[PDB]
């Protein structure tokens with residue numbers, strides 16, 4: 452319809468992550484990941500669940516393909532589990548793991564679904580964490596070797612690759628705030644991890660281009676949180692700037708060849724890595740695209756007594772909330788306009804966008820998730836505004852294809868466009884999924 456059309460070659464998909472969906476944690480040579488360790492640690496997961504079974508997608512990926520087909524998607528964004536490919540992190544290959552993903556790629560291509568592969572969505576092999584994990588430069592080197600191994604096997608068929616998904620999460624939630632695996636709580640550890648993740652990224656790009664049998668389109672995927680000061684006071688504006696630095700610019704700027712943002716370097720002081728020029732060069736290895744994951748904004752107030760970056764969220768109770776977040780579609784417009792005007796990355800993909808609700812199977816057997824339908828409608832409206840402004844946006848992936856193991860929240864927190872019955876492993880398309888289907892089909 453008028454003003455609602457996307458390009459005919461637009462990528463339309465849904466996204467998942469391996470540990471969240473696959474299960475089969477010890478099958479076919481898979482090693483132990485930090486998320487195996489962490490979810491089996493008492494108290495770390497809200498509801499006592501683990502990824503041991505999850506959606507059982509290792510075995511049931513064909514059912515997932517069925518859902519993607521029923522939704523009329525043309526792509527699927529998924530991650531490869533490093534523990535299935537190099538079970539010790541640095542060590543022998545596990546060919547059974549590569550063969551699994553090779554079959555899955557062929558199944559997707561046979562269904563007309565373009566695979567968008569993420570190499571790292573948080574499942575670091577535990578042996579590497581025993582040697583400091585992302586706290587060690589050596590983890591970056593062996594990440595790049597893993598990236599080489601996978602591209603050698605799959606790069607004849609998969610053109611679109613991301614290295615990392617959300618390094619801010621891996622570094623800050625995993626090593627500073629302790630809420631994600633491996634669960635450390637130190638700023639310096641988080642910042643060191645952030646550097647070695649970026650370095651791993653850059654080394655992997657270069658290794659991937661060398662190993663690939665055809666030219667690849669290589670990206671990185673960042674979560675970006677547009678930040679707004681709660682008032683125009685100097686204290687609140689500065690807090691917004693610091694939070695923006697903490698999440699967004701700390702990664703955008705070095706990727707853009709701009710070094711680390713100097714305001715944040717000066718703020719972090721000696722807790723930040725010494726970033727020698729050689730490493731910054733590697734970090735800025737040229738990228739073919741950037742993936743944006745968008746959920747929420749941050750409306751920031753100063754919080755002098757809080758941990759760095761001394762900025763807390765002030766919830767606007769005017770705006771409505773999902774099960775776990777404030778809904779703010781216009782922030783997607785703002786962040787895309789910022790990337791378009793202020794940074795060099797292009798084209799752009801929205802690699803995750805979605806929401807969590809208290810979804811229930813209704814008496815009729817459907818899932819009436821109208822707030823999620825409205826979430827998608829409003830965000831896609833902002834993407835059409837962004838396209839109208841000249842933003843080079845080439846695709847959209849709904850987060851998530853199906854309800855899954857939602858990290859520290861366990862099975863409790865449902866982000867799917869399809870409902871997963873975790874006892875029977877049945878999947879059912881929610882109403883929001885049928886809305887997406889029909890919206891995409893109108894294209």
Ligand SMILES: OC[C@H]1O[C@@H](O)[C@H](O)[C@@H](O)[C@@H]1O
Nearest residue numbers: 468616617620674746857866
């Ligand atoms: O809650 C937002 C988060 O959802 C998770 O399901 C995804 O794996 C993350 O990549 C994302 O940061």
